[PDB]
Curated annotation (Swiss-Prot):
Organism: Mus musculus
Sites carrying sugar chains: N6, N38, N81, N92, N102
Compartments it resides in: Cell membrane; Cell projection, Microvillus; Secreted
Subunit note: Interacts with PKN2. Interacts with TIAM1 and TIAM2. Interacts with HA, as well as other glycosaminoglycans, collagen, laminin, and fibronectin via its N-terminal segment. Interacts with UNC119. Interacts with PDPN (via extracellular domain); this interaction is required for PDPN-mediated directional migration and regulation of lamellipodia extension/stabilization during cell spreading and migration. Interacts with RDX, EZR and MSN (via FERM domain). Interacts with EGFR. Interacts with CD74; this complex is essential for the MIF-induced signaling cascade that results in B cell survival.
UniProt protein name: CD44 antigen
Binding site for hyaluronan: R22, R59, Y60, Y86
Domain notes: The lectin-like LINK domain is responsible for hyaluronan binding.
Amino acid sequence: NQIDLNVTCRYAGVFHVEKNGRYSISRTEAADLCQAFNSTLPTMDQMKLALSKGFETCRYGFIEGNVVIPRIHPNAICAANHTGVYILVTSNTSHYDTYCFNASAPPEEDCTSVTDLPNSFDGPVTITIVNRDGTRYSKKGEYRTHQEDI
Ligand SMILES: Nc1cccc2c1CCNC2
């Protein structure tokens, strides 16, 4: 009973989280996941500032109100060669990664590893934070508050 949370560097507080390295987070789960990180879904403005500090991914993830990909460099296989905060317009499906925003983070690029999920609650799941450099932190707990998400 195990969940990997793959996390990125923070840029102006904003970071990307993949559950098990595959699109698999609903909009309700995303809010709960950010909450467990003492974080919120970013606003578009917060995401634009993160972008300006060096944040890009090649993954769809929730922000507050939209599903987006932050892009600095044009890449044909990432948001169809767009740059800026690319907004997903048309999709059949409801599950993506998520972005989160932690106000207490440094103001620019923070590529130190994440070594806690400070606000997870008591639960049965072995949750493992996986950093991009492979550093891991695990704890037993839960973050999902919606039965539909479990
Ligand atoms: N950020 C991160 C950490 C561990 C694994 C993976 C990522 C993002 C890209 N997908 C794998």
